[PDB]
Amino acid sequence: FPGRPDVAVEMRQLDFLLGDFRIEYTNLTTETVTTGEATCSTRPLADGRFYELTQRVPVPGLVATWLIGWSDVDNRFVSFYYDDWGHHGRFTGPGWVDGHFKLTGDSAVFGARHGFVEDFEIVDSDHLVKHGFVVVGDDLVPGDILHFHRI
């Protein structure tokens, strides 16, 4: 068998997520715009070859995990989502492109499969924003916005 390859340099594109963040989550698809506070922690797994983002959303009652890593063979990030409600999803993205880090894929949530786009941007080293969109028909409907402030 060959030697163990080095961590892909592309993994440095995810370092902006490392650490603990307080989340101001604004849910836009409810018929009253919810808004609330959550937390999340991102740690490297598998000797830094994959990152695990755990998002604990208190009052819905939901712990959601994202695993993300670079795939040499695919030339893109790949990501697996799952939570303690039974939901799962598959995402991919190219990396940072024009100031956004977009993951595109689909998830089985609440009894049906939906397309989702997670759009990450850095505001400053300690403040991230994420726009979530859900494919409805042909367009992308604003699903949520999350502000991450590092603890």
The CATH number covering residue 126 comes to 2.40.128.20
| 3-class SS of residue 61 | coil
Degrees to nearest 5, angle at CA 74 with 97 and 8: 70
CA atoms within 13 A on the CB side of 112: 5
Q: How many CB atoms lie within 10 A of CB 25?
A: 21
| 3-class SS of residue 15 | helix
What CA–CA distances, in Å, run from 5 to 22, 38, 68, 72, 131? Answer: 34, 36, 18, 11, 34
- Residue 51 β-bridge partners: 44, 68
CA–CA distance, 123 with 129 (Å, rounded to integer)? 7
Measured distance between the N- and C-terminal CA atoms of the chain, rounded to whole angstroms = 43
Q: How many CB atoms lie within 10 A of CB 17?
A: 20
Does a structural domain hold residue 22?
Answer: yes
Does a structural domain hold residue 3?
Answer: no
13 close to 1: Cβ distance less than 8 angstroms: no
67 close to 103: Cβ distance less than 8 angstroms: no
Q: How was this structure determined?
A: X-ray
73 close to 86: Cβ distance less than 8 angstroms: no
56 close to 63: Cβ distance less than 8 angstroms: yes
| 3-class SS of residue 17 | helix
CA–CA distance, 66 with 51 (Å, rounded to integer)? 8
Does a structural domain hold residue 19?
Answer: yes
Q: How many domains does the chain have?
A: 1
Does a structural domain hold residue 17?
Answer: yes
Does a structural domain hold residue 72?
Answer: yes
Core vs surface per residue 91-125: b (16+ CB within 10 A) or e: bebeebeeeebbbbbebebeeeeeebbbbbebeee
Length of the chain measured in residues: 151
Range of the domain at 114: 9-150
Candidates 90, 89, 95; CA nearest to 76 is 95
Does a structural domain hold residue 96?
Answer: yes
CA 106 to chain centre: 12
| 3-class SS of residue 131 | strand
CA–CA distance, 64 with 37 (Å, rounded to integer)? 15
Cα dihedral value 67, 48, 120, 41, nearest 10: 70
| 3-class SS of residue 5 | coil
Token output for 31: 């018929």
Candidates 23, 33, 19; CA nearest to 147 is 23
Does a structural domain hold residue 4?
Answer: no
